[PDB]
Design an enzyme around this catalytic site. Structure first.
Site, mmCIF file in Angstrom:
data_model
loop_
_atom_site.group_PDB
_atom_site.id
_atom_site.type_symbol
_atom_site.label_atom_id
_atom_site.label_comp_id
_atom_site.label_asym_id
_atom_site.label_seq_id
_atom_site.Cartn_x
_atom_site.Cartn_y
_atom_site.Cartn_z
ATOM 1 N N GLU C 52 0.806 -1.206 0.000
ATOM 2 C CA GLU C 52 0.000 0.000 0.000
ATOM 3 C C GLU C 52 0.846 1.265 0.000
ATOM 4 O O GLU C 52 0.584 2.199 -0.753
ATOM 5 C CB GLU C 52 -0.944 0.011 1.202
ATOM 6 C CG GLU C 52 -1.962 -1.107 1.214
ATOM 7 C CD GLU C 52 -1.425 -2.367 1.847
ATOM 8 O OE1 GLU C 52 -0.327 -2.829 1.442
ATOM 9 O OE2 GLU C 52 -2.113 -2.894 2.755
ATOM 10 N N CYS C 75 -2.604 -2.917 7.050
ATOM 11 C CA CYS C 75 -2.043 -2.897 8.410
ATOM 12 C C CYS C 75 -3.006 -2.166 9.288
ATOM 13 O O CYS C 75 -3.644 -1.217 8.840
ATOM 14 C CB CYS C 75 -0.697 -2.157 8.451
ATOM 15 S SG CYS C 75 0.246 -2.512 6.955
ATOM 16 N N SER C 168 18.024 -49.174 -6.702
ATOM 17 C CA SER C 168 17.067 -48.127 -7.025
ATOM 18 C C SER C 168 17.741 -47.083 -7.894
ATOM 19 O O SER C 168 17.326 -45.926 -7.942
ATOM 20 C CB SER C 168 16.571 -47.484 -5.734
ATOM 21 O OG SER C 168 17.666 -47.241 -4.866
ATOM 22 N N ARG C 184 12.350 -27.377 -3.482
ATOM 23 C CA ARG C 184 13.384 -27.063 -2.526
ATOM 24 C C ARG C 184 13.518 -25.543 -2.459
ATOM 25 O O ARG C 184 14.025 -24.996 -1.479
ATOM 26 C CB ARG C 184 14.696 -27.703 -2.950
ATOM 27 C CG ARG C 184 14.706 -29.200 -2.802
ATOM 28 C CD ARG C 184 16.101 -29.733 -3.040
ATOM 29 N NE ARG C 184 16.187 -31.173 -2.834
ATOM 30 C CZ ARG C 184 17.310 -31.866 -2.934
ATOM 31 N NH1 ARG C 184 18.442 -31.250 -3.237
ATOM 32 N NH2 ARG C 184 17.300 -33.173 -2.731
ATOM 33 N N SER C 294 10.999 -43.722 3.880
ATOM 34 C CA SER C 294 9.809 -44.434 3.435
ATOM 35 C C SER C 294 8.944 -44.449 4.686
ATOM 36 O O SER C 294 7.714 -44.347 4.637
ATOM 37 C CB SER C 294 10.184 -45.859 3.028
ATOM 38 O OG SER C 294 9.034 -46.652 2.804
ATOM 39 N N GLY C 298 5.771 -42.207 6.357
ATOM 40 C CA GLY C 298 4.727 -42.933 7.053
ATOM 41 C C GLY C 298 4.201 -42.208 8.281
ATOM 42 O O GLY C 298 2.983 -42.130 8.499
HETATM 43 ZN ZN LIG Z 1 0.431 -2.566 4.915
#
Ligand SMILES: [Zn+2]
Ligand SMILES: NC(=O)C1=CN([C@@H]2O[C@H](COP(=O)(O)OP(=O)(O)OC[C@H]3O[C@@H](n4cnc5c(N)ncnc54)[C@H](OP(=O)(O)O)[C@@H]3O)[C@@H](O)[C@H]2O)C=CC1
Ligand SMILES: [Zn+2]
Ligand SMILES: [Zn+2]
Ligand SMILES: [Zn+2]
Lengths: 359, 359, 360, 359
Positions: C52, C75, C168, C184, C294, C298
């Site tokens: 603002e 505010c 894997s 991330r 894993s 859970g």
């Molecule tokens: Zn403000």
């Protein structure tokens, strides 16, 4: 990222559309340490420029920062330091101009002023879009001529009136409203007396916040336009008429007192390139030609048009000697007719709106 | 699911277009236990009906089955039993009709003839689609006059040639190629001799597979057509001239020897309503009226048209003496010029096709 | 819809603060005087000018009798400088267009209340959904006192994280890996169990172009069996908060702290999820990106502590019982007590299909 | 326009879908002198072929005409004349095939039989569209093994039940209803006894539009299936059980007496590869494998699935002991798990339906 920050500058710039009158819309973005810290745009004619608002908003983050600007920073050492200088003193290290000054005379003064101060200046970033922003305005500074738009509403067979010269609403209600808008985006409206006399048209953009009436220009060779025309009278918006020596001296000093700016041409017939030259002298940067089949023709055979806008209504008027869209001398040979290019097709109401541009 | 089968029938119906001539396109599907047991469309003129094809295929599965027909099944007793009676015998238990026969003395006749045998009959399913399909034919059968389509190409400002008649390069090749479609869906191409004098066109269908060819119709008042014009010597398609008593009997001779058929009208001038009616008694149901600013004018002034298609190119031919789309008479006041309605606004290449219909 | 245009603009201006702000919400303001856009502003840097303020300034005299569109309630509190609401009253503004009210129910509506007393027409609503998406996390952290929990995993089409042996190597495409990296950047922390550390020695950092203040690397230990070896510890690139219990070894604790590693010890023999999020919430973490474990996933699903599920499925079938499934642990015995979610997005990144969903 | 005809012939063939069942989808269209006079499609198993229909519908227009087939004209010389003949006997000039009969032995006979009768044979036209039209049939005929589609429903975390075996609200009624469709686009349903001992299903597509229930196939190593189970007593459909020499003799009889076909495999354990081979040797060309995370495991481990479907639910089951989607051995190393490819990702209710295929 480079072009990103410049795209933003553009979007801000656009927010001031139709709020600057005869000033170029412009935007600026101050980036610092990978963070936008200042943004700005020219919002109101004669008020703060876009590089100002941005700098101010960026405050102390201005120093060592970059600043993307849609158009080359102001560089006249006028009544206050120029935005080109204001950028200097703010400690901005790298500037990214999009495109240079439109005026062949100033173009570069800004880039120079800054560059000699140690500011690294890059140019052309999105300048392709920083061009569309102000077509009409850039045309004027690059060619010293106004930006001409030819507009008309006609039957499906290209007749702008019937055999009787009757144009009792060819196009629909929605069409007028739309066409009206252009009367707000142009410095002037233009028509040939053949219309004036047979319509007494107001020619006053009756849209929202007008905050400035467009100059009404009439073309009259022997100055025969009647004194009972809303343009002659109703002192709403200005009214200029171009004419030749053929006009009556008294009638000329008369209507000239009524506020009407009479311009006399020392030629046999009024020559379009001459009136567009005059106008660009009286500060007009754009003209909305919508008057008479004959006027539209002189404008075509001359090549003095940047834009074409025709409104086509679902109706066949016909009649061989009924005024057609474009008149004038035309082009005897097809290999000599220039090639335009359709820009946009949109349906307004039951009517269709075709718009095209040169080359 | 009802509209699935009625749509299948519509696509089958169409697989015979231009293979029936003055007969309607009809599609027919016999569904048994939720399984399509028979399909059919009217393929050749004077040959088996879509219901015939489909019911034969359907075989014994015809019993207790359903059938979706795109048009009230033939219900008159001619050489062979009508299709409606053919339905009744196969044991069909349900019939879905898209629309009743266009003829007043036949509409709903087959419907009841079927109901009459305990058959449950629905109607209207995809009525519109079923309309569009045989559109021209419907008109012909309902009004007694051929379906007339006007077509012309002009510069953006409605000019169809310059002040000198030069009309080279007004429509892009992409265009002519498109407009060539109507030369396959219309049973005739008509133009005034003027068009034969100006461009001596073949007016033939030159699209990919072009089995048959339309009847080339020229309106030549006083038989001034040139005996050497392609339309008179290429033998590629039929040619019918329409002249008045002012023609030369010895020329009609020389011309009839060439294969052309010369209709001699009784009026002083040539009334479009006159030739239109003769074309119909001749089995011609659709007419694609191409060139003739004047010709188009007559068809329009006489209100004898059902569809207007104008190709507009991004060019402006000026012209105080330039030929516009429609010439001739013409309406005197906007309060009389008939209102049309754009049906399609398609862009072809750099050109633009506008198509609209009356009412 | 001219109102919405001006509010949409405001929203757009706010997004531009996407970076610097940290906790502070993204806000956009725009002032319009007689159909003209007189001022534009947004919250651009933490601890600096509120949206603002910028826009109201750039408006100058035009403010008087103008309208202002704000994406969040102004505010109302008094501290250092005058509250944006008081600023609006004073500037002239006859009417405000608020998109949504303040998240902290302790303030909620306090500004609106104030401006109203001064005779300013307050129109609430315009594009609320949007104003909501703009700070989806911030709002959650504000309305619930808890961080925003995003759970990410990558499995085979049949839901496996590895084979019967633990292999894997090629479970999720590189395109997926990267696409999953963006989060991330959009979270203040990354959660991972001890297994993941001792098994991958991950950096849990953001490599995507343009990063400021790396997210907090939070590791859920237990018996503090995390290798002093390296990464979250030696890799002095970002903060690393390790959560342990009593079982932890004293000597080792002050040894890791000898670096800059922060350690939180709880008074339970089972790191309870809710306890961690609360400690984090207190420490000022408005968001967690839990991709590790894993079992770690859970706990988070059982306790019901997650606002976003992001599962990447590769077009591969690993199968086999004894193969590590997506979410190991307690789980839910009876079906009646299994919470229903809602798929929010079905995208296709390269060969794999990224499925996302959120709670009821 | 040679692709028009073939594309058209393709649509017509698709009108037979799920009616030809064991037979493939063919579409014969006969064209003469530039116009369709023949159209046909294989509509009912054990009945007329696509050609047979287009011929008779073309009659004498078949002499010196073309004819487009999607699949190499039949040649099975028996009960009636091989369609190869009808194509020669009718006096067909040219013939076009989109692809050759996938059946190793007769994958030339048809193309030749007419080819030697002197007819020109152009083949390969739109072979990919004609390939997709019979994805399952093609496979079978080429490989000699049925088309295998695996299906499973699971939680987003890949579970098919809770740790206590509960599975009442996994996939919504939408997914279950979508699942049904396959039950009719396949010749048999494969499931292990666990499924029977577990849910005692009916394994029949309830959807009303079925006049040929699919074969219910149960893999049951030691014949422990409940003797009073629907799949055996409700005798609504065929029930095939694959067991080993461990199956209690007396019980085999007890069940076979109910009209249940018991195939006793010669191995000790059921080998999907053997089972599949045996199935094809009995007519079954397709198989839809539902129940069995155990069974799915096998099919995957052997690589005996041409397509796999997974219905996911917006729910997280969880549980270290909760049954996974694919159980059994599984692949030990990632450098050994086949790579599939996603084919469709369409949502069904709150669920998502993932489908992928081999290599
Ligand atoms: Zn403000
Ligand atoms: N639907 C639509 O879009 C519109 C339709 N119309 C209608 O269409 C018709 C158009 O009017 P029209 O009569 O063709 O005439 P114009 O309005 O174009 O006026 C032509 C007259 O203006 C002067 N003039 C025009 N061009 C030039 C030039 N290049 N140089 C010098 N003088 C020039 C001449 O005046 P002089 O010789 O007297 O000195 C000439 O007689 C009217 O019937 C009008 O009602 C009008 C506007 C818009
Ligand atoms: Zn400036
Ligand atoms: Zn009939
Ligand atoms: Zn066959």
């Amino acid at each position: 990222m480079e072009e990103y920050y410049m795209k933003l500058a553009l979007d801000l710039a656009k927010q001031g559309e139709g709020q600057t009158e005869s000033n170029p819309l412009v935007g600026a973005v101050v980036v610092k340490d990978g963070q936008i810290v200042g943004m700005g745009a020219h919002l109101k004619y004669g008020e703060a420029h876009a590089e100002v608002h941005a700098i101010h908003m960026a405050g102390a983050h201005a120093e060592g920062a970059d600043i993307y600007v849609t158009l080359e920073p102001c560089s006249h050492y006028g009544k206050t330091p120029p935005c080109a200088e204001l950028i200097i003193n703010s400690g901005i290290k790298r500037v990214f101009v999009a495109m240079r000054d439109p005026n062949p005379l100033v173009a570069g003064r800004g880039i120079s002023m800054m560059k000699e101060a140690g500011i690294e200046v890059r140019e052309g970033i999105l300048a392709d879009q920083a061009e569309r922003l102000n077509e009409k305005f850039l045309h004027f500074m690059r060619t010293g001529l106004p930006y001409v738009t030819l507009k008309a509403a006609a039957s499906l067979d290209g007749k702008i009136a019937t055999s009787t010269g009757d144009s009792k609403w060819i196009t629909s209600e929605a069409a007028r409203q739309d066409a009206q808008q252009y009367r707000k985006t142009h410095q002037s409206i233009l028509v040939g007396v053949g219309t004036v006399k047979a319509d007494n048209p107001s020619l006053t953009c009756r849209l929202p916040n007008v905050t400035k009436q467009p100059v009404r220009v009439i073309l009259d060779t022997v100055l025969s336009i009647p004194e009972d025309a809303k343009v002659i009278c109703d002192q709403i918006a200005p009214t200029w008429i171009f004419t030749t020596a053929r006009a009556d001296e008294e009638k000329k000093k008369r209507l000239s007192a009524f506020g009407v700016n009479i311009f006399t041409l020392e030629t046999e017939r009024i020559q379009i390139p001459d009136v567009l030259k005059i106008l660009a002298e009286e500060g007009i940067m754009s003209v909305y030609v919508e008057g008479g089949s004959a006027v539209h023709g002189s404008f075509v055979k001359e090549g003095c048009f940047q834009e074409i806008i025709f409104y086509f209504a679902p109706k066949l008027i016909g009649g061989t000697h009924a005024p057609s869209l474009i008149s004038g001398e035309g082009f005897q040979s097809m290999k000599d007719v220039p090639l335009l290019q359709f820009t946009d097709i949109t349906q307004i109401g039951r009517d269709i709106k075709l718009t095209a541009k040169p080359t």
